[PDB]
Nucleic acid binder design. Structure first.
Lengths: 119, 118, 130
DNA sequence: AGAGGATGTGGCTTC
DNA sequence: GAAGCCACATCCTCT
């Protein structure tokens, strides 16, 4: 239960992510992937990220299991950085037969500091 | 000041001096052996008076509230960076695990003699 | 809705797919924080299991691959060339049945790859959706 | 005593 | 100058 957003796939939605966050820092709101069509409970869901500056960002707890059409990620974090003024392209993969993948461009910017007030 | 420890460590003046470079600077000064010194085993050292070391660290960094508790948290951050490690079981004893010989140009045996470490 | 109606057009219109059609640069995203040695074994051994993690370096688009039809032999090749490894894996990307295809140097852990519409799977899928 | 997580702060560099 | 990257400085929880 929350506020969802559409992904690049017509079969999946995901919770909202901050536009800018500090690397290795817990997210303000737990990331969730919701399936439109019927997906078997227990089905694994994973998330990856990268872009032109970082082809594959280091992530923590990027694996979750589907339960009632909802894959709730427990404390997903982004360790790798996206670069000055650059965002990550998320790749969400639902492991069915065959695997379904849903991307999400310009999902989130990750820096060492994260959001900070002027100085 | 037997040798320019801080300088040989990479400190040129750019920005604040780093904690490990600061400790090295104290370990190369005969007058500071009362509160910090080499144990005689390679680059292993011990803070015989952690409070005093913390005070100077704070003074050098302009942080009057600096105390050993916080200085040691800085040391614990060096574990993963392989700059300094803790000698398990020995109160206030740590060890430089980076390549000090290359940086300083002297081996521990030589430095211990130059500093007359008894 | 496992797929989009205009599945055929989607692959020949959207820049996302068009940019991933040519022999783009690919690379193994697995355990980048580990020694190159361990990454080599992990990558090969997992390939033998029919799975891997490759991303198109150029665009940084990551993908989790599963080399199996809708241990293999034609989906995971190891004879076509000494050192190189030709892989193949189907999937549904953004509502479009496609087939990933490329190779990787068992030493350099990188190579080239690309996507190509899957007339067969696309068809079948569209029927199930009606 | 000591390990290590969470998060803010000032120095400095690059866009 | 804003927005990055760094190396802590603070504060705490747990053994």
């Amino acid at each position: 239960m929350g506020e969802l957003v559409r992904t690049d796939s017509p079969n999946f939605l995901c919770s909202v992510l901050p536009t800018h966050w500090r690397c290795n820092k817990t997210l303000p709101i737990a990331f969730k992937v919701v399936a439109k069509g019927d997906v078997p409970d227990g089905t694994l869901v994973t998330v990856m990220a990268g872009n032109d500056e970082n082809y594959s960002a280091e992530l923590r707890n990027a694996t979750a299991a589907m339960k009632n059409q909802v894959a709730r990620f427990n404390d997903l974090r982004f360790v790798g950085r996206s670069g000055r003024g650059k965002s990550f392209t998320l790749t969400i993969t639902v492991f069915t037969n065959p695997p379904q993948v849903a991307t999400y461009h310009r999902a989130i910017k990750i820096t060492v500091d994260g959001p900070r007030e002027p100085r | 000041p037997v040798i320019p420890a801080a300088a040989l460590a990479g400190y040129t003046g750019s920005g604040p001096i780093q904690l490990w470079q600061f400790l090295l600077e104290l370990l190369t000064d005969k007058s500071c052996q009362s509160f910090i010194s080499w144990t005689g085993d390679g680059w292993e050292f011990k803070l015989s008076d952690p409070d005093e070391v913390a005070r100077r660290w704070g003074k050098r960094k302009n942080k009057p509230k600096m105390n050993y508790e916080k200085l040691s948290r800085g040391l614990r951050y060096y574990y993963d960076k392989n700059i300094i490690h803790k000698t398990a079981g020995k109160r206030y004893v740590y060890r430089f695990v980076c390549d000090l010989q290359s940086l300083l140009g002297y081996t521990p045996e030589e430095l211990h003699a130059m500093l007359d470490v008894k | 809705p496992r797929v989009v109606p205009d599945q055929r057009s989607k692959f020949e219109n959207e820049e996302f797919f068009r940019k991933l059609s040519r022999e783009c640069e690919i690379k193994y995203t697995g355990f980048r924080d580990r020694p190159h040695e361990e990454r080599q074994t992990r990558f090969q051994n997992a390939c033998r299991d029919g799975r891997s993690e490759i991303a198109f370096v150029a665009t940084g688009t990551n993908l989790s691959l599963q080399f199996f039809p809708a241990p293999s032999r034609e989906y995971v090749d190891l004879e076509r060339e000494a050192g190189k490894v030709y892989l193949k894996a189907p999937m549904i990307l953004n509502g479009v049945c496609v087939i990933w295809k490329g190779w990787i140097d068992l030493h350099r852990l990188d190579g080239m790859g690309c996507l190509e519409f899957d007339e067969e799977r696309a068809q079948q899928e569209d029927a199930l959706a009606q």
